[PDB]
Amino acid sequence: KVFERCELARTLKRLGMDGYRGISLANWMCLAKWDSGYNTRATNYNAGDRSTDYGIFQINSRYWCNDGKTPGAVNACHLSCSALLQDNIADAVACAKRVVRDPQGIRAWVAWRNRCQNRDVRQYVQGCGV
């Protein structure tokens, strides 16, 4: 499913993402936009290390979810990567919360560092009613 901007902002708010571990909703929105274009079906294979990033939050198969074909997988979220390709993002949100409980927080995602860090991210939630 490809979410509309404000539809996703309200969805994330309901799921407890606003201010989770000190991370504002706008920051999560900036990440989802740049890493997947708000698309739950997005997948990106990393030919070099043989891992795959899944879903709206592009969660990696080496560290977080299990797809059974990634060398050195840890499966920290204890989830099948399949769960990250659903239209319902509850599982993706639960895993994203797990990722940011590590010290690095949202810095774990390169897309956030590249397109969001030290930037005005307010535009992402403007007019959404959140």
Swiss-Prot record:
Matching SMART domains: LYZ1
Q: What interactions and quaternary structure are annotated?
A: Monomer.
Keyword entries, A-Z: Amyloid, Amyloidosis, Antimicrobial, Bacteriolytic enzyme, Disease variant, Disulfide bond, Glycosidase, Hydrolase, Secreted, Signal
Q: Where in the cell is it found?
A: Secreted
Q: What is this protein called?
A: Lysozyme C
Instruction: Fetch the SUPFAM superfamilies from UniProt.
Output: Lysozyme-like (SSF53955)
Record GO terms (molecular function): identical protein binding; lysozyme activity
* All residue ranges annotated as the C-type lysozyme domain in the record: 1-130
Q: Which branch of life, at top level?
A: Eukaryota
Q: What else is known?
A: Lysozyme C is capable of both hydrolysis and transglycosylation; it also shows a slight esterase activity. It acts rapidly on both peptide-substituted and unsubstituted peptidoglycan, and slowly on chitin oligosaccharides.
Q: Which cysteines are joined by disulfide bonds?
A: C6-C128, C30-C116, C65-C81, C77-C95
